[PDB]
Amino acid sequence: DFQSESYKDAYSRINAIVIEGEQEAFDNYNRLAEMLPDQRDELHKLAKMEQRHMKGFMACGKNLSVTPDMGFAQKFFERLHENFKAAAAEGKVVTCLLIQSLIIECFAIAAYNIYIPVADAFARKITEGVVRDEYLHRNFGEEWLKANFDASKAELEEANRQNLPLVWLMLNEVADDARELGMERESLVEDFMIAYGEALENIGFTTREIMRMSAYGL
Amino acid sequence: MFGLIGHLTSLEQARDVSRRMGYDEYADQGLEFWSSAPPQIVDEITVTSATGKVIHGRYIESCFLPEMLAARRFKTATRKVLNAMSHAQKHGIDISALGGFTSIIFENFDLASLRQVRDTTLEFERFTTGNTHTAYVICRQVEAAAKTLGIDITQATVAVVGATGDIGSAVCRWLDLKLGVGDLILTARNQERLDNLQAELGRGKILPLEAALPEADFIVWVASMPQGVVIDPATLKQPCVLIDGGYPKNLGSKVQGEGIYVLNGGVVEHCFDIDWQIMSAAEMARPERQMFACFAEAMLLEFEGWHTNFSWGRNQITIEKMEAIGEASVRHGFQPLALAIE
Ligand SMILES: NC(=O)C1=CN([C@@H]2O[C@H](COP(=O)(O)OP(=O)(O)OC[C@H]3O[C@@H](n4cnc5c(N)ncnc54)[C@H](OP(=O)(O)O)[C@@H]3O)[C@@H](O)[C@H]2O)C=CC1
Ligand SMILES: *C(=O)CCCCCCCCCCCCCCCCC
Ligand SMILES: CCCCCCCCCCCCCCCCO
Ligand SMILES: [Fe+2]
Ligand SMILES: [Fe+2]
């Protein structure tokens, strides 16, 4: 499993996406603080957890011979960024939570789960740690929206329709490079849908609702 | 809580069943969508025993499709089963039947060594293949069909297609020592397992499929065929009783002719309606009353509080286990599906 040549090329922008993603969740969790007063402290701790993951994944590029493409990654996330930027700037917290704690977290759970069995051993130990934190972050969105379910349901449905299609587009853009790191797109969709479905269920959506929402844009 | 882990027979059925129950997006998609689809609880079930005990259960769609095997999507098929079993466990289901090919995939791809599924470590005592009940039911169906048609089973020949299989080997053991079948034709692909089953029984002629059928008064179909084969009635004795226990059906066509009797193998009927609509999809004759024997085994384990992997692995089913599940099957109100006449 020679992890040199095109592996580093593919890794050049996959590693970038993971850095910028961990960055985006840091920002997004700090602004969610600014948005939900009686809960800034908890949101700052989760925001800090993102900080640490971002540094861990710089190391994996520094363990291989890789300098990430931060520009490609910022272009990768700009649609999700703009949607989070605009929901924040309109005070739409329910949309902000769906984007960050549901969509982005499940994107991370899927991505890392699929990564761990085919990483280099150094990257595997790091990824192994971060994945457990992402499950509790998703739990923040879940409990918030679960407690505020009736109030948030209509907006969750709208925000799912506007944002979940972006996951499919991003998973196709990044599809080729993901495969050469040993990551089948088909497994990524599946793990994403499993993680996303379970959160929607805990939030209080029914199976029929989940199956309609989870396949939107696909 | 019991669970029923199933799958559909083909993409076409997956579209129809998905076309029903709403689900417009799940019913226009091809193989690749199902290959990445997550397991889902799509039905909640309540069953009342003849004893009056009320149990509750859940149907889990694994999203496995037989076409995955023919398309060599072996890792896809492996994930469908592990994801479904993980899903049953996460929902706290005590005993779940691995219906149809989900148990075959489990054995054939050594899924036991993959019990680590994301967060979860699979607990195998929470699952059963349901195969002990299935083999018992199929044996009772041979017995009853023989009597219905005035055939003497002690002087008849029974070909078992998939004789070395988990279900097939159990059928053989019972047809031998409990029913006293005249002749047993053992039909399987792998020669070593055929030799070993013949030795274990102390009887039985091993014959490839194309030579077995013209010799058989009864053909029990319990093969792991993804697709199903076209048998011409002209190849068969008269009478010939075809008990097709395959899922998907081992008979890929409607075999009919003078002296030919076809019976859906490994199906039981309950004395009470069950509220649900999966067996409606499953194309039973009376879907409110009838179901696959493997699914009925999970209900039986739950009726009895036998929260264990009662049927597990391959070639491990005994006559004593078949008797125990059979006694419970009768007591809780289940009866083997019989030949339809008139
Ligand atoms: N309640 C019900 O109605 C149930 C129905 N079933 C159905 O019946 C089938 C048998 O179940 P199970 O015993 O778990 O599966 P197994 O894999 O244990 O049984 C299949 C056996 O039949 C033989 N076989 C498979 N394909 C062919 C073929 N094309 N031609 C000849 N022989 C073949 C194989 O022998 P070899 O090893 O030599 O290849 C194998 O040992 C399943 O496909 C399932 O769909 C199963 C359980 C319950
Ligand atoms: C025993 O081993 C054989 C078990 C057969 C496997 C299950 C077949 C019956 C279930 C199909 C009925 C309806 C399923 C609904 C699927 C929903 C898809 C969205
Ligand atoms: C290290 C694994 C790389 C997987 C590549 C799959 C596509 C890119 C996924 C990026 C997900 C980053 C999410 C970070 C947010 C964490 O809260
Ligand atoms: Fe993170
Ligand atoms: Fe996170």
Residue numbers in the entry:
A (entry chain B): 11 to 228
B (entry chain A): 1 to 342
From the paper:
The earlier discovery of the pathway responsible for alkane biosynthesis in cyanobacteria allowed the conversion from solar energy to alkanes through photosynthesis, without providing external carbon sources. This two-step pathway utilizes two water-soluble enzymes, namely acyl-acyl carrier protein (acyl-ACP) reductase (AAR) and aldehyde-deformylating oxygenase (ADO). AAR catalyzes the first step of this pathway, reducing the substrate fatty acyl-ACP/fatty acyl-coenzyme A (acyl-CoA) into the corresponding aldehyde in a NADPH-dependent manner. Subsequently, ADO catalyzes the conversion of fatty aldehyde into alk(a/e)ne with one carbon shorter (Cn-1 hydrocarbon) and the formate as a C1-derived form. Here we report the crystal structure of AAR from Synechococcus elongatus PCC 7942 (SeAAR) in its apo form (AARapo), together with three structures of AAR in complex with ADO from the same species of cyanobacteria (SeADO), in which AAR binds either substrate or substrate/cofactor.
In order to identify the NADPH binding pattern, we either co-crystallized AAR or soaked the AAR–ADO crystals with NADPH, and finally solved the AARNADPH–ADO structure at 2.1 Å resolution by soaking the AARthioester–ADO crystal with NADPH. In the structure, one NADP(H) molecule is accommodated in the hydrophilic cleft above C294, and is mainly stabilized by the mid-domain of AAR. The ADP moiety is sandwiched by the dinucleotide recognition loop and the 222VASM225 loop region within Fr-III. The 3′-phosphate group of the ADP moiety is located in a pocket surrounded by three positively charged residues: R189, R193, and R314. In the AARNADPH–ADO structure, the nicotinamide moiety of NADPH is located close to C294 of AAR, with its C4 atom being located only 3.14 Å away from the stearoyl-C1 atom. The short distance supports the possibility that C4 of NADPH provides a hydride to break the thioester bond. The stearic chain is located in the acyl-tunnel of AAR, as was observed in the AARthioester–ADO structure. However, the weaker electron density of the stearic chain in the AARNADPH–ADO structure suggests that it only partially occupies the acyl-tunnel. Subsequently, NADPH is incorporated into the cleft above C294 of AAR (S3, represented by the AARNADPH–ADO structure), before AAR catalyzes the hydride transfer of NADPH, and before reduction of the acyl moiety to a long-chain aldehyde.
